[PDB]
Amino acid sequence: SMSHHCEHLLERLNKQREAGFLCDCTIVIGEFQFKAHRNVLASFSEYFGAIYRSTSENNVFLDQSQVKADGFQKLLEFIYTGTLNLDSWNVKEIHQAADYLKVEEVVTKCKIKME
């Protein structure tokens, strides 16, 4: 019932994101743009949460010298699915994205892996 309720929610939220529906955040990293929901990002990222206490601008432009787009892609997918498939090649970038954006679930999963 509760796994069913919140899993329903998460699937729908991810369907909306993939459809570009109600996405009130656009995250920019160089020539990459990502559509998402501010309430969802705030739920997992202290960086985005701190931002949305400070401005109503939808667009957040990230420092590309601090976050790789491919890292953020995997991080966003994790936020919207609960899935984090970490391997030797992507782990550093994903770690870097989650550390910069303060998504501590992932940071810890990464350094655990990095061993």
Among 26, 39, 58, 73, binds a copy of itself (CB under 8 A): 39
> Toward a copy of itself, which CB reaches closer, 35 or 95?
35
Binding segment toward a copy of itself, per CB under 8 A, in 11-19, 65-73, 87-95, 96-104: 11-19
85 binds a copy of itself (CB under 8 A): no
Residue with smaller CB distance to a copy of itself, 47 or 52: 52
Q: Which residue's entry shows tokens 């970038």?
A: 93
Q: Are 64 and 33 in contact (CB under 8 A)?
A: no
Cα(69)–Cα(81) distance, rounded to whole angstroms? 18
Interface residue with a copy of itself, options 27, 40, 62, 101 (CB under 8 A): 40
Of 24 and 57, which CB lies nearer to a copy of itself in the complex structure?
Answer: 24
